[PDB]
Amino acid sequence: GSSGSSGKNKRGVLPKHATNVMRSWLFQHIGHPYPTEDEKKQIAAQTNLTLLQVNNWFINARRRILQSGPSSG
């Protein structure tokens, strides 16, 4: 029974190595930032993160780029 969602580290930070992989991917699919069941599996390894992490990071990331675009600041 995989678990992780429960509880959210009030403060968390990932290494540049992890942000690198995810970043590259996000940019490659900037239009549609949606990781595939596989991407989450493969990436998790390259970044050494858990399916949960890779997801959380993306969810938060996509949000940043999502808002920062259509809105004329």
* Sequence spans of domains, the chain: 14-73
Backbone φ and ψ of 27, nearest 5°? -60, -45
Distance of CA 55 to the CA centre of its chain: 5
Instruction: Compute CA distances 25 → 9, 50, 60, whole Å.
Output: 25, 17, 14
As given in the structure block, the two tokens for residue 71 are 């809105």
Angle at 44 between CA 38 and CA 48, to 5 degrees: 160
Contact 65, 33 (CB under 8 A): yes
What is the dotted CATH code of the domain comprising 14-73? 1.10.10.60
- Report the distance separating Cα 60 and Cα 73, nearest Å: 20
The whole-angstrom separation of Cα 30 and Cα 58 is 11
Q: Give kind and range of the element (H or E) at residue 56.
A: helix 51-67
- Technique behind this structure? NMR
